[PDB]
């Protein structure tokens with residue numbers, strides 16, 4: 090009553106695609122506000138309600154709940170074209186009146202077309218310049234955040250004020266990018282013209298984000314849900330740098346992205362996949378490039394929704410999870426895709442790393458080290474049974490319950506949800 | 521006992537130079553750990569203990585307490601040369617054995633010489649390109665953070681591993697900068713050579729920051745103090761963008777800068793100056809370019825310690841303070857430099873802003889708007905008496921106590937400390 094209402098947070102605990110869209114969708118059913126705080130459409134969150142499947146990127150996953158307000162915080166980077174393309178793609182799937190329940194923070198930054206093109210150029214250069222790049226989503230997230238830090242970028246509020254001033258600063262930002270890559274095209278007037286349209290198409294949804302969240306956390310009690318993007322080990326500060334995204338996907342990102350103090354943050358849920366996946370380049374200790382990897386990849390559908398690029402798969406890894414927790418302080422976990430392991434006789438789990446026959450004392454800041462470590466595994470018996478229909482703790486067979494406990498025990502955090510299917514109702518609440 | 525010990529935070533509530541060094545120094549007397557989480561030596565924190573005066577920038581202000589450990593978190597950007605220059609400058613003032621009680625996070629980023637040069641180049645360009653720049657400290661903070669977001673920058677851990685790999689990536693980062701400014705010099709081998717020295721000179725102090733803080737917050741109880749840098753309205757997200765510094769000086773920055781969850785954050789103190797100051801370019805609603813401004817400037821010594829560049833001065837402004845609080849959620853305040861107002865018959869205080877004869881509902885995200893607003897002032901009687909020797913609430917005269925209450929009341933936060941002198945003992949604890 091003194092500090093106001095506290096928000097619930099959902100964050101990825103590994104390298105992304107843990108099932109944030111799913112957990113958020115489940116928790117948004119009775120939420121008054123659902124929001125994104127960092128990242129851009131580099132994120133891809135799948136939701137399955139009824140027989141309908143959605144894949145949001147910029148839209149909060151709660152856009153589905155017509156009785157709730159979806160909010161895009163100041164920490165997010167918005168690419169207007171992608172935003173609308175996404176919305177329409179979903180409008181055709183039944184999404185209606187979204188614009189009436191979507192609010193955009195006027196302090197959020199703009200991803201411009203050249204930011205996306207430059208993202209691609211930087212990757213091609215890194216590839217032909219040293220044999221390997223980052224494995225970026227090519228959405229210009231990195232370039233946009235780079236402009237944000239430089240204070241050269243433009244924001245939502247800039248786009249809605251004097252368009253002439255916006256146009257001038259835009260042109261400068263554009264030319265500055267052609268200095269980095271003189272072959273970059275950039276149809277200044279074309280883009281500039283399209284942007285003018287987006288300004289008016291987006292004007293009625295924009296608002297002051299700070300005042301909006303403050304009012305909501307200190308006005309009559311409200312249920313505010315924060316949908317994280319990307320994941321812990323992809324964090325610009327704490328991830329396997331430089332093979333990371335360019336924002337803080339960890340808990341701190343909720344504060345800096347929505348302008349809310351730590352006391353207004355409550356439950357922080359860590360979405361943990363029963364096994365590990367990585368989309369781009371970089372160290373992956375428990376990576377399984379083999380029969381096992383193909384099975385996880387296959388039974389798990391580990392590939393990009395559009396591009397269809399398959400994701401690297403590997404055994405569960407506790408080193409990254411324990412590390413993720415040290416930074417995020419999860420209050421509970423959502424262990425997902427347990428059903429994928431239904432067919433295994435034995436499941437291995439990475440518990441620690443050894444470099445020179447010696448167990449590293451902690452997760453390496455230098456990603457290059459991880460490439461050299463040897464995983465120390467623990468083999469666990471499989472429950473070899475179909476759990477896709479499990480709806481209660483007791484429904485799960487012995488070996489499966491054991492697997493859940495294994496995770497809680499070695500992370501020191503309790504599992505509150507167990508996923509056994511992509512649809513909303515395919516979950517089990519432990520408490 | 522479940523979440524571990526909580527840290528105490530000290531943040532600036534205006535546009536910097538509120539007296540963080542002073543408040544932190546006072547609170548570090550019984551602290552086990554004192555640390556910086558964001559910023560670089562763009563910060564300047566003055567401390568006065570006994571008859572000795574210090575001005576730290578990269579070193580936490582608690583470096584003075586030989587029985588405490590000073591820690592530089594992952595969110596900070598370190599310029600090795602400046603670090604040592606600073607330390608030596610203080611060694612000559614009695615600072616001894618600092619290196620034995622200073623710990624550096626291996627995930628912190630490096631400010632390279634060319635980052636500083638580029639910072640200057642970007643400012644000269646902005647000046648001769650459009651009549652005005654940012655008023656940067658010219659420490660390359662912006663450029664370094666720009667590289668961090670791009671993932672092209674190098675970190676402490678990179679500098680301590682394979683120097684050949686570091687040298688190669690360094691060269692690339694350097695050339696990338698000459699593409700932005702082809703006239704940039706850059707003595708690749710020279711700097712590269714100096715850096716090799718710093719690596720070994722700094723090796724014994726570096727450690728894994730995440731494990732270091734986690735151990736401290738969950739091991740036996742400890743008193744951890746976090747020294748903020750810059751200030752709320754200078755925040756890259758919530759400040760008067762683009763006339764801001766390039767990191768989150770607000771509360772969220774503690775989490776992203778030290779890798780600690782919100783539940784481990786406790787008391788968050790807002791250092792509030794009795795009047796307002798701004799070092800660089802940008803809107804300043806209550807700015808007083810006159811006799812009053814000169815007096816505040818004069819009695820307050822509002823100028824850079826080295827460069828001697830005077831700071832813009834103005835009346836206290838509640839709009840920015842209330843806004844700062846919405847984002848930081850201060851638990852208490854430290855109202856400083858009250859003694860500067862000792863000689864005024866009446867003191868004005870900005871309470872709200874009017875644009876078209878109408879009171880704005882909230883702090884403008886667009887800094888350009890602020891330039892157009894008209895401040896609505898409230899005049900208060902001065903206590904016209906010397907308070908430099910006040911040590912208790914009762915010591916302060918009627919009008920002065922009233923001024924303190926005015927601040928608490930219009931901010932909804934209580935004042936816990938009142939400053940009446942730059943030295944440590946020149947403070948008054950209200951509770």
Ligand SMILES: Nc1nc2c(ncn2[C@@H]2O[C@H](COP(=O)(O)OP(=O)(O)O)[C@@H](O)[C@H]2O)c(=O)[nH]1
Nearest residue numbers: 106107108109110133134135426508509510511
């Ligand atoms: N079989 C199965 N699929 C799941 C489960 N949880 C989530 N999924 C699917 O796993 C995928 C995870 O990808 P994604 O949506 O990118 O996750 P996010 O990025 O964390 O939101 C989605 O296609 C989900 O539908 C589960 O418990 N079982």
Ligand SMILES: Nc1nc2c(ncn2[C@@H]2O[C@H](COP(=O)(O)OP(=O)(O)O)[C@@H](O)[C@H]2O)c(=O)[nH]1
Nearest residue numbers: 537538539540541564565566857939940941942
């Ligand atoms: N007279 C007076 N000076 C003060 C008081 N509090 C702080 N100072 C001085 O005000 C100045 C503030 O500048 P600075 O050290 O940059 O503050 P910081 O950046 O917030 O640490 C310092 O020179 C302090 O010594 C006070 O209550 N009275």
Ligand SMILES: O=P(O)(O)OC[C@H]1O[C@@H](n2cnc3c(OP(=O)(O)O)ncnc32)C[C@@H]1O
Nearest residue numbers: 105106131132133225226319333334368369
């Ligand atoms: O494009 P980028 O600059 O962020 O790429 C840099 C690296 O970041 C990785 N990436 C970025 N966002 C996500 C993602 O978010 P999700 O779907 O919300 O969980 N899920 C999985 N991988 C992701 C891919 C690159 O290695």
Ligand SMILES: O=P(O)(O)OC[C@H]1O[C@@H](n2cnc3c(OP(=O)(O)O)ncnc32)C[C@@H]1O
Nearest residue numbers: 536537562563564656657750764765799800
């Ligand atoms: O150099 P820069 O890029 O950060 O400059 C950008 C703007 O940031 C302002 N600046 C930066 N740091 C500080 C500061 O920190 P302190 O002493 O810890 O309170 N105190 C006062 N002004 C400051 C000056 C520029 O307008």
Ligand SMILES: [Mg+2]
Nearest residue numbers: 106132133134
């Ligand atoms: Mg995804």
Ligand SMILES: [Mg+2]
Nearest residue numbers: 537563564565
């Ligand atoms: Mg200062």
